[PDB]
Amino acid sequence: NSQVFGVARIYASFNDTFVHVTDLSGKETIARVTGGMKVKADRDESSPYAAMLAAQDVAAKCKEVGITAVHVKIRATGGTRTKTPGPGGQAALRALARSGLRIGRIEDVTPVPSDSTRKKGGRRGRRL
Amino acid sequence: VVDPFTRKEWFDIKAPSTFENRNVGKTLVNKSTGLKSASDALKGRVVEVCLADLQGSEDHSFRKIKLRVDEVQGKNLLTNFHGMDFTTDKLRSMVRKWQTLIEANVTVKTSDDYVLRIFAIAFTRKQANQVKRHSYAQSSHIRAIRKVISEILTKEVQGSTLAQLTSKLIPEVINKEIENATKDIFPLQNIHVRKVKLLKQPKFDVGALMALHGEG
Amino acid sequence: SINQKLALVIKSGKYTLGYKSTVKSLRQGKSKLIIIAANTPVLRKSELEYYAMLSKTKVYYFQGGNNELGTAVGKLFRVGVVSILEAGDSDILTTLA
Amino acid sequence: MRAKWRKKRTRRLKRKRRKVRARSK
Amino acid sequence: SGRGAPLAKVVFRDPYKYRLREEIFIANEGVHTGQFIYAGKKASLNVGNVLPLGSVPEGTIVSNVEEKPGDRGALARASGNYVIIIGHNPDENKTRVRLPSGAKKVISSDARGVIGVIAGGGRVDKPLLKAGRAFHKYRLKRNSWPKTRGVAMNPVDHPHGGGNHQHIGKASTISRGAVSGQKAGLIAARRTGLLRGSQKTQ
Amino acid sequence: PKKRASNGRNKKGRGHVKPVRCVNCSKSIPKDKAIKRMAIRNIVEAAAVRDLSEASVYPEYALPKTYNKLHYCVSCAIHARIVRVRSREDRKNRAPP
Amino acid sequence: AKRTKKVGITGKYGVRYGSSLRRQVKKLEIQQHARYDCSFCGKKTVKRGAAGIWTCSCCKKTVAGGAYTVSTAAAATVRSTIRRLREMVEA
RNA sequence: GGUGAAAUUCUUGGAUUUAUUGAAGACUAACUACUGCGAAAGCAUUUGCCAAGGACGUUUUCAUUAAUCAAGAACGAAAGUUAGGGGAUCGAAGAUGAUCAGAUACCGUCGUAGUCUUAACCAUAAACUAUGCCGACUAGGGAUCGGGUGGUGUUUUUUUAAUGACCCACUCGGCACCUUACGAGAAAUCAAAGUCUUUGGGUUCUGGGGGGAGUAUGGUCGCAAGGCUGAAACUUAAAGGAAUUG
Ligand SMILES: [K+]
Ligand SMILES: [Mg+2]
Ligand SMILES: [Mg+2]
Ligand SMILES: [Mg+2]
Ligand SMILES: [Mg+2]
Ligand SMILES: [Mg+2]
Ligand SMILES: [Mg+2]
Ligand SMILES: [Zn+2]
Numbered sequence A: 001n002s003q004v005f006g007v008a009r010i011y012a013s014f015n016d017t018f019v020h021v022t023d024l025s026g027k028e029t030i031a032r033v034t035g036g037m038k039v040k041a042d043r044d045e046s047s048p049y050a051a052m053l054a055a056q057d058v059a060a061k062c063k064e065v066g067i068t069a070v071h072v073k074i075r076a077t078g079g080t081r082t083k084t085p086g087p088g089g090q091a092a093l094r095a096l097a098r099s100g101l102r103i104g105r106i107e108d109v110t111p112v113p114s115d116s117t118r119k120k121g122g123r124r125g126r127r128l
Numbered sequence B: 001v002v003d004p005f006t007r008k009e010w011f012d013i014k015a016p017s018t019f020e021n022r023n024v025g026k027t028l029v030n031k032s033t034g035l036k037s038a039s040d041a042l043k044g045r046v047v048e049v050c051l052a053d054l055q056g057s058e059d060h061s062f063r064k065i066k067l068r069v070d071e072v073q074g075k076n077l078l079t080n081f082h083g084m085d086f087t088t089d090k091l092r093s094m095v096r097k098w099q100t101l102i103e104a105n106v107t108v109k110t111s112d113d114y115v116l117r118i119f120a121i122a123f124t125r126k127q128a129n130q131v132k133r134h135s136y137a138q139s140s141h142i143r144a145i146r147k148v149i150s151e152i153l154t155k156e157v158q159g160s161t162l163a164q165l166t167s168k169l170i171p172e173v174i175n176k177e178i179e180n181a182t183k184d185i186f187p188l189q190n191i192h193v194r195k196v197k198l199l200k201q202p203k204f205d206v207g208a209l210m211a212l213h214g215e216g
Numbered sequence C: 001s002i003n004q005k006l007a008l009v010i011k012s013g014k015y016t017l018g019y020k021s022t023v024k025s026l027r028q029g030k031s032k033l034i035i036i037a038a039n040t041p042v043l044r045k046s047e048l049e050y051y052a053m054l055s056k057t058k059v060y061y062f063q064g065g066n067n068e069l070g071t072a073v074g075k076l077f078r079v080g081v082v083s084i085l086e087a088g089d090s091d092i093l094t095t096l097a
Numbered sequence D: 001m002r003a004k005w006r007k008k009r010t011r012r013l014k015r016k017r018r019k020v021r022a023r024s025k
Numbered sequence E: 001s002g003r004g005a006p007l008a009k010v011v012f013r014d015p016y017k018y019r020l021r022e023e024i025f026i027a028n029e030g031v032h033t034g035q036f037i038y039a040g041k042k043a044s045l046n047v048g049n050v051l052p053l054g055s056v057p058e059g060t061i062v063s064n065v066e067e068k069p070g071d072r073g074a075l076a077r078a079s080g081n082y083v084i085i086i087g088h089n090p091d092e093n094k095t096r097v098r099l100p101s102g103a104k105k106v107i108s109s110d111a112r113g114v115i116g117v118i119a120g121g122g123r124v125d126k127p128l129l130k131a132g133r134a135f136h137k138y139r140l141k142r143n144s145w146p147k148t149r150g151v152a153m154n155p156v157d158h159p160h161g162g163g164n165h166q167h168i169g170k171a172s173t174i175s176r177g178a179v180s181g182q183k184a185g186l187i188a189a190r191r192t193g194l195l196r197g198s199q200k201t202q
Numbered sequence F: 001p002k003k004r005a006s007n008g009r010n011k012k013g014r015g016h017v018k019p020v021r022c023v024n025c026s027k028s029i030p031k032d033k034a035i036k037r038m039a040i041r042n043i044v045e046a047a048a049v050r051d052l053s054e055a056s057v058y059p060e061y062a063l064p065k066t067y068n069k070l071h072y073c074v075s076c077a078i079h080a081r082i083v084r085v086r087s088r089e090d091r092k093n094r095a096p097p
Numbered sequence G: 001a002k003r004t005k006k007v008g009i010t011g012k013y014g015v016r017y018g019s020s021l022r023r024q025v026k027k028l029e030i031q032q033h034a035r036y037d038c039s040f041c042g043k044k045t046v047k048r049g050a051a052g053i054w055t056c057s058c059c060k061k062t063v064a065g066g067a068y069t070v071s072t073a074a075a076a077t078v079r080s081t082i083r084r085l086r087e088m089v090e091a
Numbered sequence H: 001g002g003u004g005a006a007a008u009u010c011u012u013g014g015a016u017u018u019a020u021u022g023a024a025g026a027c028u029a030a031c032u033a034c035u036g037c038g039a040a041a042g043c044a045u046u047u048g049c050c051a052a053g054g055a056c057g058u059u060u061u062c063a064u065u066a067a068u069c070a071a072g073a074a075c076g077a078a079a080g081u082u083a084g085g086g087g088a089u090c091g092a093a094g095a096u097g098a099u100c101a102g103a104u105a106c107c108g109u110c111g112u113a114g115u116c117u118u119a120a121c122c123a124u125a126a127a128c129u130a131u132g133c134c135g136a137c138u139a140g141g142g143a144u145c146g147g148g149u150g151g152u153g154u155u156u157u158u159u160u161a162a163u164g165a166c167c168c169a170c171u172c173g174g175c176a177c178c179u180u181a182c183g184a185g186a187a188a189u190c191a192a193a194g195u196c197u198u199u200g201g202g203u204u205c206u207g208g209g210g211g212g213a214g215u216a217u218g219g220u221c222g223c224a225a226g227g228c229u230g231a232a233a234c235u236u237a238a239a240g241g242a243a244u245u246g
Helices: A048-065 A088-098 B051-055 B087-094 B141-159 B163-167 B173-182 B206-210 C002-012 C019-028 C042-055 C066-073 D003-023 E131-138 F047-053 F073-078 G008-013 G019-034 G073-091
Strands: A005-012 A017-022 A031-034 A069-075 A102-108 B008-014 B023-030 B046-050 B061-074 B076-086 B103-108 B115-123 B189-200 C015-016 C033-036 C059-062 C081-086 E007-013 E021-026 E050-052 E060-064 E084-090 E094-098 E103-106 E113-117 F020-023 F029-030 F036-042 F065-071 G044-050 G053-056 G063-064
Touching: A005 A048, A005 A088, A017 A048, A017 A088, A031 A048, A048 A088, A069 A088, A088 A102, A088 F047, A102 B087, B008 B061, B023 B046, B046 B051, B051 B061, B061 C019, B061 C033, B076 B163, B076 B206, B087 F065, B103 B141, B115 B141, B115 B173, B163 B173, B163 B189, B173 B189, C002 C066, C015 C019, C015 C066, C019 C042, C019 C081, C033 C042, C042 C059, E050 G008, E060 G073, E131 G063, G008 G019
Parallel strands: A005 A069, A069 A102, B008 B076, C033 C059
Antiparallel strands: A005 A017, A017 A031, B008 B023, B046 B061, B061 B076, B076 B189, B103 B115, B115 B189, C015 C081, C033 C081, E007 E021, E050 E113, E060 E084, E060 E113, E084 E094, E094 E103, F020 F029, F036 F065, G044 G053, G053 G063
């Protein structure tokens, strides 16, 4: 087993997707290209086509540095927000695997409270 | 215009001898310069590693161990035990409807001055002929179960060190000890110790770290 | 815990309330247990432990002050120390420590 | 009108009528 | 007299001579007579004790805090005020603190401070209610009371004095570079009017 | 008239329940009300299980799941089509589909 | 017989200074002249000297305190925060 | 960032993201239910004190001590009478950016009073089950919570024992639910909203077409908002409830 491990941290909100690779410790990040700078439209920042384009750019950089395999940790916005991973999470996780990188230990790391502070809207909701 | 990746080393992460696969992985740091070393930049990193990867077996796929870097010597760094946590997949899967979630925790120090907070979890269950569909426990049973769990979780850490605690967190001897002491109150399926946290550490006492390492 | 054990003592057994009676009973050697309130002065507290050490008498520490000790004894004033001379039909001389 | 706001409008009118009663005597 | 907070007289022993050494501390709230006060590097985290600022954990409440090591107390001396320890920076040893004004200061870890809050707090919550009570308060401090308004003066006496009505005439916000005799009003004011907002600006 | 004998949802013996917040618009709605769905999904879709099989170390190890409880207000649940209006006779049916 | 309806101790001020200012003085004056229980001898004998000085007539103990009450809200929260930090240190 | 789209805003002074370490800020997410407690308002992780309570069990005790109650009291959702701290998530307002014919709104970003003090609410809510309380009877069923009783029942281990947990049956007391309609109702529906022209078990409160109007005036609680009590002149042929067809 000569694989060298990184940690691919994927932040999938409904506004943008983050693909972020560090080493085993969270310091010394390797590559981080967001979904919002592969398409310049300000509304397709969370699109799955944007997230897979970003995920190829991490894998091209991770191959250059030397990282061959990765542990992927995926999160949603969390806290008092939606807790549902955005549309870019599934495309970015898939596109890392087809790029030649190896993958192990998929884990959900969405920050989930213990009935913490208040939320959007104010008791009548964001009404539309 | 700098290309900062061609100035970094690679350091091997070494697990303590309480685990089998002592080679965890490799980590980066910058080149040591004038009044900026690499030892002080690596001496606080915490590495999260699955207990399945430390032991090799897939039975420990749902537990992770925090490992904190303490000493660097000769292009590999020696880690110590920093904390154990459960994965979010299993911790959210054992929480099912139509059963009672029982949680007990305690804060206690080891034989060496290692203040830890230990978290335990337990769940009620039906037993093989139950027709009713929830099998809840009364509040007096949960208070009686918590008193037994907290007594076992306290009396065990009094007569052990951090190395002795880590050795017996692997074969689930605590969960069998909780089960044999609470089976006369409720059936109590799915007993686990779900988290230990490092509250206060003692002095560095490097020989205790070298005693944990130094093989292979 | 300690309240109704004391409530068995004052109904049946013998007692003395106060510092001067307690030291007198310790000196003449018929004090089986002394109970010291939490806010008794440390110099006065240290003198009682020395008298108890000399006479081989167990010392219990009340968790509250003189107001709470006199209330648990059953009086309407403040009691700083209480010495038990006879347990009566109470187990306060054995159910300690 | 909504009955909550008709109640609110009556309260302003009741308060300002008392003020007019006050500046005279 | 003239100080809102009470003082505490603490008697030590002279370590190099057979005598006693009486100090005057600003009394912390909870300190009583006959209480033993421990001062030094190895003192414990108790109210009334004097400790170096590097020997206390984060979140400790201190008072009479030295600005420099050895100046015997500069910060948080008035009644009901205190200093919070917010962080340590051990190499090139320093300690970040929060002052009563809300400002953040970095001072040396060797500087000392007394554990607790200054006694006598809540003094200003009582209305003075009378001109005679503000008389007796400033009788023990200095000659600064009562104050005649500048718009009630003649122009010879004040920049604001004069006019057929009582009025300033020009803006009362005065530049920092103005000279003596010109600095009457609001010196170097960044804003005026009623404070519609918050404090601790980022 | 009274549309439902539960007046919405089942309080029936309490008087007050603490409210939850909607997940689509953050409208406060009581916990006895506020339609609840349990969202269990694999963190890789069915179109990626084949993809993730070859690109994985630890061959045929596991595939974990996401566990999420969703709370919906009545307006969001109707608009998101997790619950639709039904006939007066079919309003009484309490069984899941 | 009850002598005043609501002014109480602030009846010595007559009709002056305003009612809202007489109410704030009344609240702090009742605290300031109140008698408090000593934490050393256990008797309700603690009275104020000057502001911040509270002395027990029996047992002769003087405690540094608040201006108009023996202990303030800030000091008790500080005392609990200090104890929690100290027990963390000594553990 | 943020949105239906965008914009305000922050960004080589490195934003966002990652790690480590701290510090203040309702409550206790999942467990959590046609489940529990409480007179109601209301009350969810622990642990320890302090008193309290229902139900059950009872061949203990008193012997009518009771039911409902003008006057008179206690208790209380939250949202502001008033005086320290800590520090914004939401919008009153306020600032702004959109949208629009306008947008002083919905939506976006920020933010002062505003469910955190220790100390009052006069006491207001669709304070709702829009169903007063006490007592008796009338109809079937399966669940569930608390207690009790029985089983030549299961399991836990020492072999079975004692408990506990589970299964079957019964009983008392609860939160409710399902089917019918003898019965009621204008209907919707209802095991009470039944036992009512075959009209009487006891008792308290409220209403008498719609407005004017919870207004005027007087009193009272009231440093406040405002509660509690509370008309008339005049005006009007409908207002309203439930259901049917479009
Ligand atoms: K002038
Ligand atoms: Mg002035
Ligand atoms: Mg003046
Ligand atoms: Mg003049
Ligand atoms: Mg003149
Ligand atoms: Mg001039
Ligand atoms: Mg001028
Ligand atoms: Zn005293």
